[PDB]
Curated annotation (Swiss-Prot), chain A:
Detected in forebrain. Detected in dendrites of neuronal cells. Expressed in the pyramidal cell layers of CA1 and CA3 and in the granule cell layer of the dentate gyrus. Ionotropic glutamate receptor that functions as a ligand-gated cation channel, gated by L-glutamate and glutamatergic agonists such as alpha-amino-3-hydroxy-5-methyl-4-isoxazolepropionic acid (AMPA), quisqualic acid, and kainic acid. L-glutamate acts as an excitatory neurotransmitter at many synapses in the central nervous system and plays an important role in fast excitatory synaptic transmission. The M4 transmembrane segment mediates tetramerization and is required for cell surface expression. L-glutamate binds at residues 32-33. Induction: Down-regulated in the pyramidal cell layer of CA1 in the hippocampus by global ischemia. The postsynaptic actions of L-glutamate are mediated by a variety of receptors that are named according to their selective agonists. This receptor binds AMPA (quisqualate) > L-glutamate > kainate. The chain holds residues 644 to 692 of 883 of the full protein. The modification Phosphoserine is found at residue 40. This is Glutamate receptor 2.
Length: 49, 50
């Protein structure tokens, strides 16, 4: 129990958050935030969309 | 999930009429995306991005 609690690393940046799927996430239904994700080709960001 | 390697080997190819005008160029076309990897993109992306 204690080792697993100590190993829990809180999400800080995008890539570490991107790999995990326990915590859901999403953007607005409109706006340039969605359009940025589509046009982005970064491996962190292409899988983001 | 999938376990182990491929027991046999085959391939997927496009269909062209006998001696068609698209016989040699498309065959050259399909083969030339395998170097810079733009064909390699389209396979691993659709399989393992969305």
């Amino acid at each position: 129990f204690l080792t697993v609690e100590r190993m829990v690393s809180p999400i800080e940046s995008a890539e570490d958050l991107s790999k995990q799927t326990e915590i859901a996430y999403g953007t607005l239904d409109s706006g340039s935030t969605k359009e940025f994700f589509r046009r982005s080709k970064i491996a962190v960001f292409d899988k983001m969309w | 999930m999938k376990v182990g390697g491929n027991l046999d080997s085959k391939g997927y190819d496009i269909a062209t009429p006998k001696g068609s005008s698209l016989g040699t160029p498309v065959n050259l076309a399909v083969l030339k995306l395998s170097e810079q990897g733009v064909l390699d993109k389209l396979k691993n992306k659709w399989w393992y991005d969305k």
